[PDB]
Amino acid sequence: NLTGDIVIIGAGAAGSLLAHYLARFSNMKIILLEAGHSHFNDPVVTDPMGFFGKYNPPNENISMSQNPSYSWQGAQEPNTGAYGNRPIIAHGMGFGGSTMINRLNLVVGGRTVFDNDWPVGWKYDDVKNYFRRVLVDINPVRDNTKASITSVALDALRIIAEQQIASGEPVDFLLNKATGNVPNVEKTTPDAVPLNLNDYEGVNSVVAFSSFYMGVNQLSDGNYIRKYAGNTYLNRNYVDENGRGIGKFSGLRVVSDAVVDRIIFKGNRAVGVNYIDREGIMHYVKVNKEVVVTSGAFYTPTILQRSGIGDFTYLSSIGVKNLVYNNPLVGTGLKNHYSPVTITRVHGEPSEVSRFLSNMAANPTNMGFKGLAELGFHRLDPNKPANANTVTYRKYQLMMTAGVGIPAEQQYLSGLSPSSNNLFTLIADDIRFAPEGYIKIGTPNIPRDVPKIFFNTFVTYTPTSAPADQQWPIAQKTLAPLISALLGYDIIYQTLMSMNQTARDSGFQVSLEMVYPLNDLIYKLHNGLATYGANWWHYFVPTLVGDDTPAGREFADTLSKLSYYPRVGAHLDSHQGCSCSIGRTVDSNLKVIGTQNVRVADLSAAAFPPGGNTWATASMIGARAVDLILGFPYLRDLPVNDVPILNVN
Template identity: 30%
Template sequence: MAKRFDYIVIGAGSAGCVLASRLSEDPSVQVLLLEAGPPDTSIWLHLPIGYGKTMWSKKYNWCLYTDPDPNMNGRRIYWPRGKTLGGSSAINGLIYIRGQRQDYDHWAALGNEGWRYEDVLPYFIKSESNERGASQYHGDKGPLKVSDIAHKDELIEAFLDGAEEVGIRRTPDFNGLDQEGVGYYQLTTFKGLRCSTATGYLRPARGRSNLTVCSNARATGLILDGCRAVGVNYLQRGRKQSAYIKQDGEVLVSAGAIFSPQLLQLSGIGSASLLQAHGIPVVVDLPGVGENLQDHLQIRLGFECSKPITTNDALNSMRGKVCMGLEWLTRRQGPLAVGINQGGCFMRALPDESDRPDIQFHVATLSADMAGGKVHPYSGFTLSVCQLRPESRGHVRIKSTNPLALPEIQSNYLATDLDRRTTVAAIRAARQIARSQAMRPYIKREVKPGPEADTDEDLLAFSRDTGATIFHPSGTCRMGPEGDAMAVLDAQMRVRGVQGLRVIDASSMPTLVSGNTNAPVIMMAEKVADLIREERRQLLTQAEHSR
C-alpha cells in the first residue's frame, strides 16, 4: 500500500470504529482502519438474540480459551471476543452500563489526569443517542443508539419485586446519579436491531474518501524506526502487506485486552526478560505490557420455572419460534429484539466493607449450561452474579514469535480472599431474592448450585467448578503516571518510550470499571479522539507561526 496515512487504527472494535469515524471527520487527514475479521454481514450480528449464534462462531468470534487456571480447578475458561467490524460490540449482550462515578475518580487519583467522572461524562453524553432524550446524564445526538426494553416481562417484574422485598430500591437509570438499585437494563439497540460501533459509527463514515477500511487484515507487527512507530505489517488473505504513516502520523492500537499487548510484545515493546526469552530485540522495556489482566467472573444460578413463560419455552417449540419471529417482524419487539439479559441489579454483597455496589446481577429469562449455549428442555431462567471490582490479576504473554499463535492467557480468578468472600456473598444475595415472596410462585426448583450446596465451602467450590467470564477482560496495557513502573501508557494513552503510538481499548483501563465495558471503551475512544485532534491543531498552529 503506497499511500501514507495520518492515522492507522488497528482493530475495528468498540474503540477502533469510534476512532476511525471521529478522526476521519477531518477531511484533511487520511485514516486506515485494519480489522482481522470479516465484514459484519451476517443477520445474526444485527439481531439482538443473535448473541446465541455468534457466541460460538469461529468466523465472527476469536473463540479464545484461557490457560488452565489453578484457582478454577485447572479449568480452561472460554473467552469469546469479537472478530468482525464492530468487534465485541457486534457480538456482546448489548447492555449499556457506564460504571460508577468512583471508578473514574479512582483512575484520576492513581495519577491519570483528565479521567475524573466530570471529565468523562461529556464523552458518554456525546457518544449516546438515548431514546429517553437529552438530560444532565444522557445525550440524544450521538452515534450509539440506546433503547429501553419495551415489554415488561412477568418474570423480570417478579425479580424486581423480590429485590425490593429484601431492601433494594428500584432505579429507572443505572447510568444516572447513582448506580445502586434494581431495574431494567437499557440496550444498545434501535428499532429491534443491534447498534454496534460498526453500525453507529463506522457505517455513516464509510462514504468518506479519506477513510480506508480493510477487513480480513490481521496485524502481525508494528514497524518501528528506532523508538518511533512508522507503520504496521499485516496479513490479508494470506498476503503480507505493510502500511505506513506520514511523518507526524500515529499508529493507534485498538485490538483489545488480549491482542493489543500481544502486538506490542511481538514488536519489541514489553518486559525485557519475556522478549529476550523469545529472541525478540528489546525496543522499550515496559514490564507492564500484558500484566494487570482483570475480568468479571460470572457465577450462574439456574432455576426451573413453575410457569411456561420463559424464553426456553418459546425456543423449544415451533409455535413459540414462529410467534417470536412474528412479534419481531410486526412490532420489532419480543425476545429477538432484546437478546438475553433484561433485568439487572447493583448492590452491596459485603455492606460492612463497601460503601457502594460491589456486585452486579444479569437476569435472563432463559437457562443453559453456559452463556450462549443450547437452552434447557424445561422452563428455565438464570440469575447471574459477578463481583464488580476484583482484586485478582492475571496476565497475557506471548508463547511464540509467530504472530498467529495465541498468547498465554492466565485469568487467575478468585486469587484473593476478598474475591472469594464477595463471590460467595453474591450467591447468597441471589438466593435471598429468589426466596422472596414475589419470586416464590415462579420457582419450581433451584437447579444449580442446588439446595445441597449450602456452606461457604460448597458455594466457593461451585464457583470454581462452574464460574465463567462475563466477557470484560481489561487492564493489560494500563495507563498510569510517570513514576509507575508498570504503567504502559500515559494519560493520553501514548505508549511510554515510543513516539507515534497509542493504545486505546479496554487494555488501557488501569482498573476494571464497575459494570459492562462496552460503553466505557466507546467513551475512552471518544475522549482520545478529541485529544488527538487537539494535539494536531496545536501542531498545525505552531507550524504556521514558525513560517
C-alpha cells in the same frame, strides 16, 4: 505503499469510533486496519437474535464467539483456581470487533469507579460527556415486554433495601448514597418511571430497574438490527464497499482482512505498520504522525511485545530481535468480570407457575434480560474499599433470565433441564472481580490466537507456618473472589426469600426455591453468615481456625462444597481489559510510555474495570483519544442531536 497520518490497528468498539471522528474532525489521512471484514449482509450479525444461534447451521451449531471466522480464539492457560480449566474467550474479528458478536447490553459503569479507581483527568466528570456521546450514537432501547416476575423481584428488593436503610448499617448491597432515605428501586405501579442505570450524573450507582438498554434499533418495517460500533461508524454513508471514505470522510481508508503483525520504529518513533492480506502478501503502511493500537485487551499487548515494547529479558528469550522500550508491565494487569449462575425452581399449580414465568422470552429489545440491578458490597464482604461507607461502589450486576444458564455438564450433574418450564436463572456478576492476570506472546513471528494468557480465579489459600493472626489478612486477599461469589449467592437467596412474599402479595400462588447451587448448602451458608458474622470466611481455611466442633466442621464442609460452584457453575465474562492500562503501559494521554507517537485507545488502556459491561467504556476511551490526538475537545463538544446516520447498505 499505503501512507497515513494516523494509523489505527483494530476496528473494534474503540477503533471504529476513533477512525470515524478523526476523519470527520481533521484534514488528515486516517488509516484503519482490521483483521476481519464487514458483516452488513450477514443475518448472524445483523439480526440481534443471531447471537443466540438463530442462523447456525445444525451440523456446525457454534456461537460467533466460538467461531474462528468471526473471532479470535483466546485460549487461556490452565486456571489453577478452577481445576486447570482453559476457557477460550473471544475478541470479535470484523468491523466493530467484539460489538459485532457481543450480547449488546450497553452499560456505562457508574460514576463511583471513575471517581475513585481512575486517575486525575479520568474522573467521572471528565468522561461523562464521552459516555453520553457513546450512548446517543447507538441509541439503545429498553425491553419491549413487561414480565410480572420482574415486578415481583423489584418489590422484593424494595423490601430488603428498606431493611438495610432502616438498620443504619454503613455498607450493604442495596444501599445508594445519592438517593437519600428511599430505596433506589424502580416502582411497580402502572405508570412507573423507569430508573436508568446509565443516568448522566451517575446518581444511580446502586439501583434496581426493570430494564437494561440493548444496542439495537428498530427499523421502519418493525424489524430490529444490531446497532454496534461497526455499522454505526463504518457503514456505507461513511465508507464505501472498497474501504474508501466518502465526502467529508474521504480522508478515511479502511483496509479489510488486514492482519497486522507489528509496528516498525526508527529509534522510539513509530514510522510504519506491517500487515498480511488475505492472499498471504505482506504490506507496509507508512506512518506520518501516530500509530494507535486498538486490538483488544488480549492482542494490543501482543502487538506491542512483538514490536519490541515489553519485558526485554522475556522478549529476547523467545527471539524477539528488535527491542524498542523495556516496560515489563506491558500485558500485565489483565482484568475481567465473572458470572456464577444460580437456578430457581418455581413451585405451585402448573397454570400458576406458567403465569408467573410468562413474558420472559428473549427478543432483540432485551437480549434475554428481565432486570434487575447494579448492587453494592454485601455487608459481610471484608474487602471493601477504605471509603466504601462514604461513596457507593458497584459490586454485582444482577441479571434475571429465562431458562437454565448453567453449563451442560452442570445441567446433567444437577438434574436441572433446560426444557423444564418451572426453572429460571439469576446471576450476580462480580464486576469488581479481584483476580489479575497477564498476557505474553509465546513466539515472535506472527500474531497468534493463543499468546500465553494467565488468569487464575478461585484459588485456594495454603496455610504457612506463620502465626494465624499474621496469616488471616493474607488469606483475606487470596480468598476475595470466593468470598464475593458466595456472598453473591446469599444476595440471591435473600432476594428469593422476599420474592416468596411479594409473589403472594401480587396474587401468585407460587413458591420459589433456590436449587442451584444446592438449596441445603445455601441455607447452611446463610445460617453461617448469621452465626459467625464478619470472620465467617475464616472457615475457608479450617486448619487455621481450630474449631473442632461438629458445627464448625459442618460449616467448613459447607464452604468447601460451595467453592465448587463458582468454579464450574459459571461463565468467565468476555469483558477482558486493563492489560495496557493508564499509569502502567500508557500515560493519561494514552501515549505508550517510551514512545514518541504510539497510543493505546481500547479497553486495554482502562485503569480499572467499569461497574458493568465494558463496550461503553471501550468506545469512551476511543472517543477521548479523538480529542486527545486533535488537541481540542471536538467530539466532547459535538451536539447530542448530531449522530451518525445509519445505512444498512
